[PDB]
Amino acid sequence: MKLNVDGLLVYFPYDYIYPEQFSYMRELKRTLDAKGHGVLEMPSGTGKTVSLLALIMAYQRAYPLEVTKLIYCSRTVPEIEKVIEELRKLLNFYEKQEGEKLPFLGLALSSRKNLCIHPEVTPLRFGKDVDGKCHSLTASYVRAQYQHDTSLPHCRFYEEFDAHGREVPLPAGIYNLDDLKALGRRQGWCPYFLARYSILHANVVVYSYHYLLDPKIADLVSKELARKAVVVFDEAHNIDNVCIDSMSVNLTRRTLDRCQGNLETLQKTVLRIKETDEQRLRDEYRRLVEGXXXXXXXXXXXXXXXXXXXXXXXXXXXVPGSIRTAEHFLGFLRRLLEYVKWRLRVQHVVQESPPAFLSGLAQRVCIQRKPLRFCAERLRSLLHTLEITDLADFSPLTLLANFATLVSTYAKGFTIIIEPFDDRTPTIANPILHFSCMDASLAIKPVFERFQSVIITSGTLSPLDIYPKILDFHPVTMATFTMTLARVCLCPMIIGRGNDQVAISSKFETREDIAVIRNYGNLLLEMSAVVPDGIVAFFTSYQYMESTVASWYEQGILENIQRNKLLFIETQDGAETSVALEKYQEACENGRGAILLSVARGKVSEGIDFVHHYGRAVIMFGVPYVYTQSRILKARLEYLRDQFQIRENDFLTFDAMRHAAQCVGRAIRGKTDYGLMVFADKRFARGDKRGKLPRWIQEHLTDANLNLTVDEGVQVAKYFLRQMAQPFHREDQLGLSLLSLEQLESEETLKRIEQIAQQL
Amino acid sequence: XXXXXXXXXXXXXXXXXXXXXXXXXXXXXXXXXXXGQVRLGMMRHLYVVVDGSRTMEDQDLKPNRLTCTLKLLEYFVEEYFDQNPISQIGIIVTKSKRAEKLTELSGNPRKHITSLKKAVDMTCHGEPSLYNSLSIAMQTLKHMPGHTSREVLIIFSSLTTCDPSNIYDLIKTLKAAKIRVSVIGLSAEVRVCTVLARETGGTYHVILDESHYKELLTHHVSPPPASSSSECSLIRMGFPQHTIXXXXXXXXXXXXXXXXXXXXXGGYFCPQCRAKYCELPVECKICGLTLVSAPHLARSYHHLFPLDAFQEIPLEEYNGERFCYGCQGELKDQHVYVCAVCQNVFCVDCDVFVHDSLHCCPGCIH
Amino acid sequence: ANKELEEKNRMLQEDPVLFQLYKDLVVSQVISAEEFWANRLXXXXXXXXXXXXXXXXXXXXXXXXXXXXXXXXXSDIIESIFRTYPAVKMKYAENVPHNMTEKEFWTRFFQSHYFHRXXXXXXXXXXXXXXXXXXXXXXXXXXXXXXXXXXXXXXXXXXXXXXXXXXXXXXXXXXXXXXXXENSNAAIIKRFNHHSAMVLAAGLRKQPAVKRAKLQESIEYEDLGXXXXXXXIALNLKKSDRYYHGPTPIXXXXXXTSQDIINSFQSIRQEMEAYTPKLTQVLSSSAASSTITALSPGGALMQXXXXXXXXXXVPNDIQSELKHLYVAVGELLRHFWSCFXXXXXXXXXXXXXXXXXXXXXXXXXXXXXXXXXXXXXXXXXLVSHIEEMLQTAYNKLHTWXXXXXXXX
Ligand code: SF4
Ligand SMILES: [Zn+2]
Ligand SMILES: [Zn+2]
Ligand SMILES: [Zn+2]
Secondary structure (H helix, E strand, C coil): CEEECCCCEEECCCCCECHHHHHHHHHHHHHHHCCCCCEECCCCCCCHHHHHHHHHHHHHHHCCCCCCEEEEECCCHHHHHHHHHHHHHHHHHHHHHCCCCCCCCEEECCCCCCCCCCCCCCCCCCHHHHHHHHHHHCCCCHHHHHHCCCCCCCCCCHHHHHHHHCCCCCCCCCECHHHHHHHHHHHHCCHHHHHHHCCCCCCEEEECCCCCCCCCCCCCCCHHHHCCEEEEECCCCCHHHHHHHHHCEEEEHHHHHHHHHHHHHHHHHHHHHHHHCCHHHHHHHHHHHCCCCCCCCCCCCCCCCCCCCCCCCCCCCCCCCCCCCHHHHHHHHHHHHHHHHHHCCCCCCEEECHHHHHHHHHHHCCCCCHHHHCHHHHHHHHHHHCCCCCHHHHHHHHHHHHHHHHHCCCCCCEEEEEECCCCCCCCCCCCEEEEEECCCHHHHHHHHHHCCCCEEECCCCCCCCCCCCCCCCCCCCEEEECCCCCCCCEEEEEECCCCCCCCCCCCCCCCCCHHHHHHHHHHHHHHHHHCCCCEEEEECCHHHHHHHHHHCCCCCCHHHHHHHCEEEECCCCCCHHHHHHHHHHHHCCCCCCEEEEEECCCHHHCCCCCCCCCCCEEEEECCCCCCCCCHHHHHHHHHHHHCCCCCHHHHHHHHHHHHHHHHHCCCCCCCCCCEEEEEECHHHHCCCCHHHCCHHHHCCCCCCCCCECHHHHHHHHHHHHHHCCCCCCHHHCCCCCCECCCCCCCHHHHHHHHHHEEEC | CCHHHHCCCCCCCCHHHHHHHHHHHHCCCCCCCCCCCECECCCCEEEEEEECCCHHHCCCCCCCHHHHHHHHHHHHHHHHHHHCCCCEEEEEEEECCEEEEEEEEECCHHHHHHHHHHHCCCCCCCCCCHHHHHHHHHHHCCCCCCCCCCEEEEEECCCCCCCCCCCCHHHHHHHHCCCEEEEEECCCCCHHHHHHHHHHCCCEEECCCHHHHHHHHHHCCCCCECCCCCCCCCCCEECCCEECCCCCCCCCCCECCCCCCCCECCEECCCCCCCCECCCCCECCCCCCEECCCCCCHHHCCCCCCCCCCEEECCCCCCCCCECCCCCCECCCCCEEECCCCCCEECHHHHHHHHHHHCCCHHHHC | CCHHHHHHHHHHHHCHHHHHHHHHHHHCCCCCHHHHHHCCCCCCCCCCCCCCCCCCCCCCCCCCCCCCCCCCCCHHHHHHHHHHCHHHHHHHHHCCCCCCCHHHHHHCCCCCCCCCCCCCCCCCCHHHHHHHHHHHHHHHHHCCCCCCCCCCCCCCCCCCCCCCCCCCCCCCCCCCCCCCHHHHHHHHHHHHHHHHHHHHHHCCCCCHHHHHHHHHHHHCCCCCCCCCCCCCCECCCCCCHHHHCCCCCCCCCCCCCCHHHHHHHHHHHHHCCCCCCCCCCCCCHHHHHHHHHHHCCCCCCCCCCCCCCCCCCCCHHHHHHHHHHHHHHHHHHHHHHHHHCCCCCCHHHHHHHHHHHHHHHHHHHHHHHHHHHHHCCCCCCCCHHHHHHHHHHHHHHHHHHHHHHHCC
């Protein structure tokens, strides 16, 4: 539908919109006029991906100067597939309207799990083993040995892509992972390296977060592309958690024992290759002395492992010290390994700053700072040198070498915390070593430096006052869009009152209180007896879901929940969860009642979305606090007190509410979807915790619904479902919660859309 | 706990009257009726599937749901045989994951209402079974002839739809067997009944009150319009005259009956097989002919040349015809209703009477 | 197999009137037993057209007691366990005498994995629990998620999954820390996952296509597209005057020439001017006396009607005779007019019509024999209605014969 969004025509790929839609489109015109970042909040009602891709395609169709390339970033591979197919719908609409005058290269991109063909690599199930066999079958040196012989191993895909495939760009076709694999089958190529080679020619690229924010993966979108690039994150609550997962490094005693075995293996390899060859070691010493390890770096496609984990602006251009002879570098890694192993021997929890660890190094095993920076460059050049094949075998030592880089680079923001035993362990032999970071800003800092205008957008983000206060961030637009409705469409209730008038809570900190778990089971039973077609029940921790569903069996509850609906409990297997989800979705459609109870942290509620009739009543059990984790929490909170200015009790409440309202706000797809969404404990009524739920849920949280009983909540659920199971046809929306062609041109509608959207 | 503050007062003498009048006016509503000049399914083997679930015993209605549902089905059988005479009804109670053909497909209200008066006394144990109930309704409704709009009405309450097999192959079969299934639902919307209703061709509805549930069953009394799929055949019909004992039984034919009977002297014959039937209309028990007295075709002629809308105007508005053209009375209220063709004057009583019972404008006859 | 015999018998027993009929037709030498039981298919599909699927609490509906180790006789429970756990089915194939009884076998059935939801080395259900674990590992390893096409693929819902090396939350799955109660609670989780999976699979009897299907389903919105309304074929009647004067035959309606309109308007405008005699003009008394003479029971308008002279002489046993006769001739004409109507122009249906002709002629012989054995008692009670029905069967048979011989 041909929108006027105050400067430009926009072909919306549906012949109807919401008003929330056009408010979002106004504010995103605002963010792309002035080159600034902006944080938006469209709730899950609209097609925010639909709108988002529509306006970015409108700018790229209308302005070939300011915006070169869209980099969408959605976090899970099914969301990659969804965003590609909505882009494909919009191109099909775009080509219905005009004809085959498209040229538009949509492109997904994930990994060698999902773009490899070869029938000996394909039956591997893991990412590192697929990377190892792809490093076996092609390299910089195995490819040359095949190039001057015949029977040496090769893929036939990368070789044929090397033969012809690097001169024909992909003509204007929006490609999924499946379509791209099919084109790799067709002419006979690698679609992995085709996708990476065709990053340069695309207009929309849709990959994951860790393919952009990791400094040791994202070396594939250069500066000149980034100066006119628009990056759009999507579902971006845990950006700070992605950063802290993206730069912290964990060392384990098993990692160090396999590092010792690796060190002996590489010592034997240096001995036998010293018996074999000498001339390329002379060339090694040349390209260390002469250059800065870039001699054979021009032809480097599959010879690249994970790069140096320092950021793009803190790397150096000097010569690697005393390291040069590989015998002495094995001695260097030997010293570093034995010192970190001796440091890990301490049988109490020890927190250090990284300069204290560097001084303990530089005093007690004589290793200085700059040869400890260049350890990543040295191990990558050495491991390229000695022709060795299966790099999965060398996963620990590279880890250790990469750990060395971080210890020798960053200070005052990061923290080296040593644990002799974990929290749920105590006194079992797992001494681990978190080089943990707590600057969230030091991983998105080159993302704001390089890129023009990055757009954090999610359905839930609250409060918006804190994402500039964590990410070292100053946006143009800080927008919240109010859910305008012609029908209530949702009701949140805070069931914080047992049927015995017992205060429902989780104050006990996972050590079971009996009557509260009793009232949780009573809530689940009676809400099962009311709600149709699938109830989703998020607990706090898997130990707590474990303990709760344990004491729902010895206590006589869970058979009654069986009598009403079919349970599908969760486990932390990767395949058992998928089978329980599949049976849960085959039981919401074959008549019976299905109820999926999970944990509000894991992968069950990150990508796997619950649409019109899969979850009607999202039961958020408890307030999700990170309670199991170590002094990483205390140290990140001490950091946010000190060098940012964010309180203890402010950040804990913010984190708990972003997880709770993250897991709740998936139930609703459109305006014609209705989701009961209950919150079950009293703490969600206490003003600060309720104050950090998003605006489109606080708008429909009535003071009567605030602190309901179990049975009052059940009767509100019954009245909700009965008032909201009637024919709510399209003719009930054209006034309020929908807009036609000609309902847009009225300036009264423009006054309405001015009144809907607000800023912070 | 403080509803007592709902009573305001401005002058307090007629202001409590205004609050009471606002409440008494907000405690009532009007129906929504639809008109169509479209083909209707007038021979109509409808087949009622009631729950006998555990959720029938819930007390959301003023008696438990079984009793209210069964009372309105007694009213439903009454009005459906009062309005469509050719058609038939069959009643299945669905109980304990199994389905029970409680009253076979017949066309007289005595047996059905007798069986519902019996079925007040039941137990309602177990979970229902939509598979087996649609299987029994399909099994009887395979072999009715193709011009019959074969319809099933599932008054369905519970949520666990405990089938013993796959119920999407039934919906594909019933899609191909051109049956039509409509579900009236209690307390919720269930996805499977929604797919069943939107795919077989029917309509799904959920219940607020007594009055809304009466409106839904009244909506399913009338013959629903046909798809582009149902056969438009020409059923061979028989019109047997009534025959008393000929001339004081001078060479009569003394029979018992044809379905505890006495000695029948005379009555209704059949023009195909020459049997003896007491009551008309009855499908021929030994021939397959359908026997019609033919006001039973005239009892449902109003569906074919239907009514129109009354132009409803409340105000005074030019009325030089002060009296009701219906029954010659004054219009002491502010609602005047004027027809389309003749454009005479009618009041509210004549409105409800013409549009519900007499089914014709008294002006357009003249 | 002697199935049919047992059916026709069971019926005859339960249905003595039908038995009667069966005798009055087969035993009376009119038709043969095989034909009668052959074309009389009217029964149920199965015991309930299916069974009762295991809803849930198949171990906890009337738990461990047909009144722990109480009695075990409930049919729903044993059939639902027979469907639900095929390991218990194979165990019932094995250890059923052959040295245990249902008391001891079901007492060894309320053991773990089945009633207590445990996981330990135990009695005779241990290998059955191991086979159930192998079935779970076959569903997880030899099988996977079928609709992992665009969602629900929980193993690979992360594009870059690594080991526990370079991460933050690497202490997720711990190879250490295996307790007793914790492993029991994980066992309860696994047994309920398997229990609900077996319920859903027992109630369900035995590529870019699926992926684009799930993508196009989860993307779309019901609001922003097309509507949901099927059609309504417009019935615009052509000739509605055929409805206005309906199936009433044309009465003699000949109003004469329109001169009479003017004459009658003149005479009745003159007539209704001078008016109201009330005493004089209304009734002469002789007309009233003749009217009372007429409405008296021997005059005109008293039609000598509502007489209804009946023949109630020997009621009861003749009524029983006529019940037998109308049941029998109803079955005969049932078969006749059921196969008769459409000619069904082939040789099998014509052969069934010839068998119907033979049954018809012998039916007429048996009806004449029954009339001779019945009506020769006290000389009353015309049975000639049954002879009218059978004479019309005779007539349709000869008329069809002449019609098909014209159609030769
Ligand atoms: S080179 Fe291509 S085909 Fe060979 S393993 Fe790598 S991705 Fe697979
Ligand atoms: Zn007949
Ligand atoms: Zn009129
Ligand atoms: Zn009137």
